């Protein structure tokens, strides 16, 4: 089992902390959803290769430009997250998070991940966003942003229902193993 390192980046509202929690427990918490994630080493077997994938969050580091890059050394794969119920989080991907990740993690694969895909057809979500002349992110808008920023791939998931969460982390492991 080789050791690989994953770091998730994105705005505070993208749901990155919840995604790391639901993956590490293989369960959306039924009693208490933790405010914070410390770290985790997941045992993953992808395509017959065994890997120990260390998981890290950047939540709470968004306003601190000198503390935040301390999470980046020796990273093997970046998960760049946005929320599908938040077009503003997708707008921040190409000129805030992408230049930073490419500077501190050169040649490290980036997977653009659209979180909260369960809210794309949520009526309360559609009514609230319509007030600010907005709508949930379309699948093609996510694919085009991933293509534009030079992402390794584009994926979607829902931490609430667990759909697509395992696939994201198995693909991150595959990306971390590439030359």
């Amino acid at each position: 089992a080789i050791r690989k390192k994953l770091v998730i980046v994105g705005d505070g509202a993208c749901g990155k902390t919840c995604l790391l929690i639901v993956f590490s427990k293989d369960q959306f918490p039924e009693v208490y959803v933790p405010t914070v994630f410390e770290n985790y080493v997941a045992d993953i077997e992808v395509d017959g290769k065994q890997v120990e994938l260390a998981l890290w969050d950047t939540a709470g580091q968004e306003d601190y430009d000198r503390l935040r890059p301390l999470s980046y050394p020796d990273t093997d794969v970046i998960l760049m997250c946005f929320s599908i119920d938040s077009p503003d989080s997708l707008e921040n991907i190409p000129e805030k998070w992408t230049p930073e990740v490419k500077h501190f993690c050169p040649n490290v694969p980036i997977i653009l991940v659209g979180n909260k895909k369960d809210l794309r057809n949520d009526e309360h979500t559609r009514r609230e966003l319509a007030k600010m002349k907005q709508e949930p992110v379309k699948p093609e808008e996510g694919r085009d942003m991933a293509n534009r920023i030079g992402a390794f791939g584009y994926m979607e998931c829902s931490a609430k229902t667990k759909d697509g969460v395992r696939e994201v982390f198995e693909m991150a492991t595959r990306a971390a193993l590439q030359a």
Partner: protein, 245 residues
């Protein structure tokens, strides 16, 4: 971590730590407030435990088993004793507040109503000055510590055997040398998230809502001062590289 504290913080939440008959006596908003305070104390207990792995397992083991050059162990673990002193004292105060709150005849049923004042004390005066001075130094030596560890692991056979030996047990899975350094760096930026969620469920008593509002501002002031006092030290960097920064 001592067994008494581990058992007290073994449950996933405060609602699962207390007796179900004691839980039933509280309103929904108090259970939500207590679940977040329990998360803050339990993660502080884990943070202090991370600092003890660095001081007792790693640092002390290298001094008593290996023959490294002078100033190498200090370079690997900068400010670990000072950090351990700040957080063991803060953990002591948090656990003492939980202990005083316990019902007579019980070692698990408690409600903490007055956390704000303790947080204002930790993030103001001399203790905030020491946290700022210590994190500003530690975070500025982060990259030098990681590069020194990699050189030692790759070139020293006895150091590599030592690391492989002490990190082999399953309880050390998340706690290698580099993982411990990032766990500590990331700790301070977890406080605003926890304090803000505690504040969200502390409107019942105006004085408590005000004390947590003051505590949140003091934590953010501290983080801004630490962030502004960081410059990565580099072994071998010349003065010219430094003043042309």
């Amino acid at each position: 971590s001592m067994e008494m504290d581990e058992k007290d913080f073994a449950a996933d939440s405060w609602s699962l730590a207390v007796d179900s008959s004691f839980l039933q006596q509280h309103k929904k908003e108090v259970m939500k407030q207590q679940d977040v305070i329990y998360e803050l104390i339990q993660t502080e207990l884990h943070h202090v435990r991370t600092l003890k792995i660095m001081t007792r397992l790693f640092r002390t083991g290298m001094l008593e088993e290996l023959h490294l050059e002078p100033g190498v162990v200090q370079g690997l673990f900068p400010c670990v004793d000072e950090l351990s002193d700040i957080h063991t004292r803060f953990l002591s105060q948090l656990l003492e507040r939980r202990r005083q709150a316990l019902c007579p005849g019980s070692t698990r049923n408690f409600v903490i109503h007055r956390l704000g004042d303790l947080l204002i004390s930790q993030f103001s005066g001399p203790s905030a000055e020491q946290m700022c001075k210590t994190y500003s130094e530690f975070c500025s030596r982060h990259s030098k510590a990681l590069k020194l560890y990699k050189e030692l692991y790759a070139r020293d056979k006895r150091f590599q055997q030592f690391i492989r030996k002490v990190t082999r047990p399953a309880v050390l899975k998340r706690h290698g040398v580099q993982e411990c350094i990032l766990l500590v760096t990331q700790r301070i930026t977890k406080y605003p998230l926890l304090i803000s969620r505690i504040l969200q469920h502390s409107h019942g008593i105006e004085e408590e809502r005000q004390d947590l509002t003051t505590a949140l501002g003091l934590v953010k002031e501290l983080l801004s001062n630490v962030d502004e006092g960081i410059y990565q030290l580099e072994k071998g960097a010349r003065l010219q590289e430094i003043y042309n920064r």
